[PDB]
A paper describes a structure:
SK catalyzes the specific phosphorylation of the 3-hydroxyl group of shikimic acid, using ATP as a co-substrate. The shikimate pathway is comprised of seven enzymatic components that convert erythrose 4-phosphate and phosphoenolpyruvate into chorismate, for subsequent synthesis of aromatic compounds. Overall, these structures have a characteristic α-β-α fold that consists of the CORE domain (residues 1–31, 61–108, and 124–162), the SB domain (residues 32–60), and the LID region (residues 109–123) in the monomer.
Enzymatic analysis of R57A, R116A and R132A revealed that these mutants completely lost enzyme activity, suggesting that R57 and R132, from the CX site, are important in catalysis. Instead, E53 from the SB domain forms hydrogen bonds to the guanidino group from R132 (E53 [Oε1]-R132 [Nη1]: 2.21 Å; E53 [Oε2]-R132 [Nη2]: 3.58 Å) located at α6 (CORE). The R57A mutant structure shows a notable shift of the SB domain owing to the interactions between E53 and R132, rather than those between E53 and R57 in the wild-type structure, revealing a crucial role for R57 and R132 in defining the best active-site geometry to accommodate promising substrates.
Residue numbers in the entry: 1 to 108, 122 to 162
Write the structure that this text describes.
Amino acid sequence: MQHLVLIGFMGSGKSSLAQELGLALKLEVLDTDMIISERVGLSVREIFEELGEDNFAMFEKNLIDELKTLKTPHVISTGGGIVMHENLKGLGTTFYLKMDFETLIKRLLTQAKELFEKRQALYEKNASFIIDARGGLNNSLKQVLQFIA
């Protein structure tokens, strides 16, 4: 609960922001996309295609509990599977990196819009803080650094 937890959709650019936020604050950064792929042995993309998003999200939800094992404060990029998460706020201060749907869509249909709407509601229910992604990585970073001050 002094972990800084970047949460948001996959493709939102949280991993890269995490990297740069760690560097700025002299903190280690952990990316649950990385851990899950490292431990499962398959790429994010293969897990998504062969096992589905619900199972990615399960992988993530099980890693969260382990992440409270951490003796030091970390930047943690996670939340690609918010559907399965109950309250990652118990992991630390969570920042939702909020991107509009059309912009998320470019970086990666009525059914996708439906999903996006439902999951955004979960992200902001799980967020201690909201960072507006529209302005790009450094403007998101400034936002996070301003919350910290």
